[model samples]
Target: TPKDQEIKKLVDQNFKPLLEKYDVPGMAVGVIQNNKKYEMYYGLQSVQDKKAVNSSTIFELGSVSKLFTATAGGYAKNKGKISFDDTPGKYWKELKNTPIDQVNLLQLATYTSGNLALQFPDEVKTDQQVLTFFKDWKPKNSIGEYRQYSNPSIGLFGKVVALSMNKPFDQVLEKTIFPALGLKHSYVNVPKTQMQNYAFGYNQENQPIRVNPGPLDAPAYGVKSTLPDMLSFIHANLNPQKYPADIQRAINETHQGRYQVNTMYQALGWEEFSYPATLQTLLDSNSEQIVMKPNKVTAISKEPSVKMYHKTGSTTGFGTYVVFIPKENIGLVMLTNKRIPNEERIKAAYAVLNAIK
Candidate 1:
């Protein structure tokens, strides 16, 4: 009991000053370790209205939604509905001539399908335009040769999974993934009934802006979740056996690491590396070139002793960070209304993990 109180106190002290340091209006943090859970909330959801953020305050998860999409794909795979080697063109025949057709589902999910642009091109203003653009696009490099983190690549992967499940991408996640994982307030699109819990995210100038709907809405940057729900998702990953059989299988399938991009290990939806991992090694993986172009694989291993599984996501406003170590049985989720630097989050997360140990 004393150790629990000390850990809680340590988290409180470490996160308090970060509010103003990062110009963050509000943030919700949830931590799980040693079979105990501690949730800490700081600041207001709205600076002008003074609404304090709570466990139920929903924040946009941005690219972190990719993990949910990956889980959906895994569920489909486990159900005998899809295979990781399936070609994208199989589901959307219009992509028959595109580079996507040549790549398998795993390549797209792992960001190793040559180089696809991060976002849809500006000319792709409508859903129809998005479909047309991809239909003619070609890969800059051969499949399994590079790692270009692109929404379109994973977006197509999610599309294939949806087709296999016979439902919209968001519908499959909301109806299948969320319910199976016991996530009560996570959604690809926040429904009107849950609007009251949605927290507005603020831009650099402290002006509010929500993520605009885009072609990759459901598969790439569409999820909005509460601190409680996201933490539960982390818990399931840390100990999948505690969940239902199918959900456990899906969760295990997602954790299978198939490639290594420099020091970063690429899992289905999570980017990972061996522990005692330095902040520099983690930051190096986010270099400008790596973000825009693909990186050559330095090595490949099948689930090579994953020490930490982490992901960072941001839209125009919100920033989200999640990290976990299954061996240590510890993990935490950090959600803020303002888009802050990745360094601030990494520093905070490391501090918490170190203190707990």
Candidate 2:
């Protein structure tokens, strides 16, 4: 393993220039090894203020948060809060408008529910309104018809998970999962006290953008977190023994694809890219996995004794990435406020990952 000093130097040398190349305002990264964490920062937190980014700064985690919502469902299932096969209509009465079927909780959680498209149309307002949309939406395919990535599908799944747990989604996230993980710098809803550190997102014009997303999007993209907290999440997922066995099983099952989202990837609550082999082979293989969810990008490797799971998030004015290579015991978390191209930051991370050990 490279010493901490060498690790920092290698990471900085490779990523700093890339951040500049991409015009990223600022980035904070957290790395994990043997359950130990090391973090690094580069560039400005905000383009207007020119403040340097730091480890404690938080940004909207975007669709990376969906992984957590799925995990929350896993947590609930672990606690017998909900079952994978639970019907959505059992918990939500809003399905009266939609064609009700045997669509179970797991189908929605994993994006197997053939609901309306991913993003809500411009006019619809609330999460409940999405249920109405689904009621009106005609299904091109039946339930579990190849994984199609959609917010209403997953949001409604989150709602099902929330109802199954008998608590609001935010409460379940805060009370059950956050505390369970012992995270101090992570949240679903930004608390008022920490508003100062809440990082603002930017658009292409370098203007400030609202950090808060739509209600339906909350379950998919509404997490704010620091490097420390994000690394904590990475370690827990990569090394599930750190959490309960049931949670570990849930986490493992998440990556174990049950359906295909596209030719290049398979389904796992979010879409995951594999070797693009046979459908079954891709679904079963965990060798190299890249998950590109709604607003997040993540990759993981569990081969050559190097395992990495990474996710990235981007919106008009924000971008972020999280990665973990468990065999190397290494992880990274990065978030930026500017509307930078998301791929540049990921390329920077791959460079650093190659340099590590």
Candidate 3:
């Protein structure tokens, strides 16, 4: 109970400046430490109606939503429905013998599908077009040879999980992943009835908008969620032992390291630093050059590691960041309606986490 006071103090002190600095309109921040949770809301969810964000107010998780997709893949693997070593061709006949077929699910999940771009090209918009694109795709390098973080990489990994599990992308997530992780208000598609709970993300010109569907959007950056739901999801990652055996294994599997790029390890959908990482080192790993361009990586064992795991996500209007260090039993999720730089989100989380014991 006393830690609640300390956490509230820390969040306000560190987070308020972020809203002011970025001119963000609304935010929801939640921290889970030592199996305890604290959520703090700020500003308006909708400037028109002036709705204050609450625990139930849903915000876009952006590519942080990739973690759910990875968990679903890991769940299917743990349940013996799929294997990370399986290629896209294993699930789709059209992809068989294609270049992407040579890329196994592990490579896709770990961003090692040899230099796929961040998203499908503007001209490639439909499902058939996406497959045709993948059909014609050429690897810039060998599979598992390097890390180039891309939405297409994880997005396809999730698509294959859907095929292997025999469900739609959102179905697997809504029915399997969210429930397995004990999440309630997270959704790849926020229902019409719950539309009232969704926040309008404010853009640069102060116009409000949310994500529009794009190729692989469901598996890429589609989830609309709340701080409470995300806090629970990350807590499951932190304390998997509290879950059923199969789900626990699935959660643990998501944390297994696949490649070492700079100071970060590429896990299924999470990126992490070896334990005892500094704030500067975190910024370096999360820098523009490291993210926007290809980077050489050293292959790492896929066993679980004790590290500071974090992910930075954003759509056009929303910015999301999540971090949790298992050794410290701590986690932080920041959801903002206005998009901001990944570095600033990292700094905010670092400030809050470092301020804690």
Candidate 4:
């Protein structure tokens, strides 16, 4: 209990500095130990309106939604709906004549799809245009050899899975994945019934705004959830048997490390590394350099590192980070309504995790 109290105190003490340094309007943190979990909300959800945040306050997950998409892909695969080895052309005929047709689902899921751009060019606005853009596009590198982080690749992977399941992407996630995982509050599209729980996110100018609509919206950076639900999701990932056989299988598949991008390991959507990973290394992995440029890759490793699993997400107005260590049986989630630097996020997260003894 002393350790828990110390951790609580440390959390309270370190958090204020982050808020002040980043000028973040608010943030929510959730932590887990053994099987117990606790969440703490800090600052105002709306700085001017002065709405205090709570466990029910929902935050946009940004690209963290990729994990959900990848999980859905795995579930679809397990259900014999799709295969990771299936070429993109097999599902979308538009890609049939393009270099991307040669690309497979696993490559897209792992971000080793020959240097796909982060987002489409300005001219490509509609879904049909997005497909057309892929048709004439040329990859910057050979497939499965470089890690070029792109929403298009993973978004297309999700699309293929959706087509295989014969359901809209949102329908599959809402009607199947969320319920199977026992997530009561996570969603790609927040229903009107739950609208009041969604917190306002502040842009750099302190203007309040939420994520905007885009072609790859739901499949890429579209999940919104509260701290409590996210913590439970992490708990489920830690101990999959807590759920049914299908759910457990899906969770396990998402954690299977499939490629190496430098020193980091790439799972379906999660990025993993060995235990005691340096804060600098974690920060570097999420840095602009790593995000904007394709990185060298080595062979795939089906065996996961029995240590850390993590992901970082950002939109114009929000930043989020989640990390779990199975060996320690602990994980942490940090959600803030400002686009704070990944360096600060990694530091704050490391401080909290390091304090846990």
Candidate 5:
């Protein structure tokens, strides 16, 4: 109880302001210290149909889902089901002549596949449409020349990951990655049994919302999870050595710094910043220019770094951010039904990380 109380005090001071500042519907916070888990919740899950969020409440992960995507890709690579060195064409003939096929899977997962669009055209909503969309697409730069964060790139990587594994994306996620991560309440498609616990996200206007998934969404932005379950995922990321060999391999791949832009190191899905950094450094690293522009990149060594690993995820309705420092064995998971500014999320999470430290 003292531990929970301490966690409550830290979260309340650092996180409670964001709830009011953004008028968010609900928030769930989870912190992990080595193997210990502490959780706290605030406000209503849905304002229209009020109930508090708890450890059991499920929230969509948004791009936080990409970490899972990259991990699966890494696992497939470890199992020889996929090769990051191979292009997507190796798995699908349809991509053989496309611009994308010229780039390897590693480039795709690292956001260095030239300049894939951040979001595919909404009209490109099916498998065939997605294939055709890339078929005629042209690249603005050579592969690995620049880092442009895009869903289509990782989404396609996930598809190719599934193709190489000979399983659907959902199947690989549900049966392989989820199981490997010991996540019982995480899902590509949340089951009916857990529907009641799945929170309905609210938009900036405070109206109820749910995702209308687009093509290639399953791998890029289609996982739902709870505070406790997500904390487990974060814990696993921080201490992969505790897991079996295969998972450690996968998690290690995700952490290997593959690209660098200023103070950031671009790992597979998670972004890395040197630890003992400032709030201004984090804000700059996660600013709009970093998210929306194509920035030239310098290749970095593939070795993992002692860094503050962080990512922000958002859908039309929900916003989530994760930060973990592996060396300190400290991590934070902040999930909210209402989408909020990335800077605010980073600020609040940074505060709590300092408090916890």
Candidate 6:
């Protein structure tokens, strides 16, 4: 079991300076070992009132929400209720005549489905916007050939999941999964009761920013959760005492390497820094010179063979991270309310991993 007192000391000695350097509002961190779980809050939740974030504070999950969607799909898989290859057309006959006839559920979840970007254009907020966007779009690249991490593909998977189960995705989440795990703070929409507790999202200018997503957009990027909720998920993930054996195996599959996009190794839902690359080399990997999001900073390993499995997330107003060392059963998560540059988070995650190692 890991000890929180020592971890807190490490943070005060290390990350506290970086937090001061960046002026980030605050971050909620979750940690899990075999039988121990710890969550710590750093900095203010809102600068105006100096309200600090706590263990129960809800921050946007960002792309981490994609893992939840995939988890739901995996559970459905174990129950034989859905197949990864099943498409929107197969589950929802209403979509049979649509242009995306051949796109399957797996491609959608993995972001290999054609033409859908992660965010919708303008203020198109209805299901009709989603339908219209895909109808007008075509797969620009070959199916399942390249990894174009887009929102539309994963969003469509959520849409399909709802249709497959004959209920809205949120209902499936609330009724089936959240209850099963005894999770209280994880939700598709910010519940009315938790509204006041919702942390204020920030912009680069350090001003309050509106949450960009609405209901139709919720499935893709609309989840709110506390550090403990995440810790609970990771704790269950690390130790599968109550879950069936098949379900645990399915989660192992989620972390297995899925595709290679430049210097990064993407697992089914997570990613690992597959190689050592400086910022310039990382940028050069993309034609647009945009480096793929990293789980932690580009950790230059002192030891040549220590591999890190990770995921880093950036959205308009939120930045998040989750990383684990499978060999050591160590997991660390950081969810923040402010739009702090991911470079800081990359550094923080790497430092924690190094300290624990």
Best of the candidates, lDDT: 5
Which regions of candidate 3 are displaced past 4 Å?
301-305
Model 5 lDDT, residue 4, Cα: 70
lDDT of each: 0.83, 0.66, 0.86, 0.83, 0.87, 0.67
Question: How do the residues 1-357 of candidate 4 rate in per-residue lDDT, one tens digit apiece?
Answer: 676676677677766578888788899988898988877889877776788888988899988999899889988888877888998788776677678888889998888888687875656678888787778777778888888898888888988888888888888888999888888999888989987777889998879999874775678888898899889888988898777766677888888877776667888888888787888778888877788987888875544456688999888888898989898899999999888887777788788888886
How many clashes (backbone N, Cα, C below 3 Å) per candidate? 0, 18, 0, 0, 0, 2
Off by over 4 Å in 5: 301-305
Which of candidates 1 and 5 is the stronger one according to lDDT?
5
Model 6 Cα lDDT, one tens digit per residue, 267-347? 556555443434433223332323333222222233224444555565566777776665567778888877666666666
Lowest-sum lDDT 10-residue window in model 6: 295-304
C-alpha-based local distance difference test score of model 5: 0.87
Tens-place lDDT digits, model 3, residues 1-357? 488888889888888888889889999999998888899999988889899999999999888988888888888899898888889998977999988888998988888878687776767678898888788888888888877878888888888989888999899988988887778898888899899999999898769998985777678889889999989988998899998877898888878777777677777788877777889878887787788888888866433455888888898889899999999999999999999888888887898998896
Tens-digit lDDT track of model 5 for 1-357: 487787888899988988898888899988998678888899887676677898789999999999999999889998888778999888988889688778999998988888787887888878888888878878788888888999989998999999988999999989999998889999988889988888989987888998878878877889889999889989989889888887889998998888788778888898888887789888887778888998999866433456888889999899999989988889999999999999988998888888773
lDDT of 2 by residue, 23-120 (tens): 66777776777777788887776656666678778777876788788788777777786778877767776664356446777777766665546675
TM-score of each: 0.94, 0.83, 0.96, 0.94, 0.96, 0.85
TM-score of model number 3? 0.96
Ranking by lDDT: 5, 3, 1, 4, 6, 2
Q: Model 4: which residue pairs collide?
A: none
TM-score of 4: 0.94
- Cα lDDT tens digits, model 1, 67-186, are 998898889998988889888878877777676688999988888778687886655677678778777777778788888898988988998899888998988998999998889999
lDDT of 5 at 200: 86
